[PDB]
């Protein structure tokens, strides 16, 4: 069976795309596995004693 996703649904029910389906898509685009991540700090994290915000 072939599950199509990046395709329009005329009756608005044909090809629904879920969180896991897009999740797998994003992993292939950037070239990452379940052992690595994509991280970006827009603002530096604050350090207050034995805590990290």
């Amino acid at each position: 069976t072939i599950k199509n996703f990046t395709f329009f649904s005329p009756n608005s029910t044909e090809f629904p795309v879920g969180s896991n389906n897009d999740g797998k898509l994003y992993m292939m685009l950037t070239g990452m596995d379940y052992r690595t991540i994509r991280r970006k700090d827009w603002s530096s994290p604050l350090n207050t004693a034995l805590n990290v915000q």
Binding site: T1, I2, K3, N4, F5, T6, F7, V17, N21, K24, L25, M28
Partner: peptide, 9 residues
């Protein structure tokens, strides 16, 4: 750019 899955195909 089109994503699809082959499940027991």
């Amino acid at each position: 750019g089109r994503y699809f899955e082959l499940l027991n195909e």
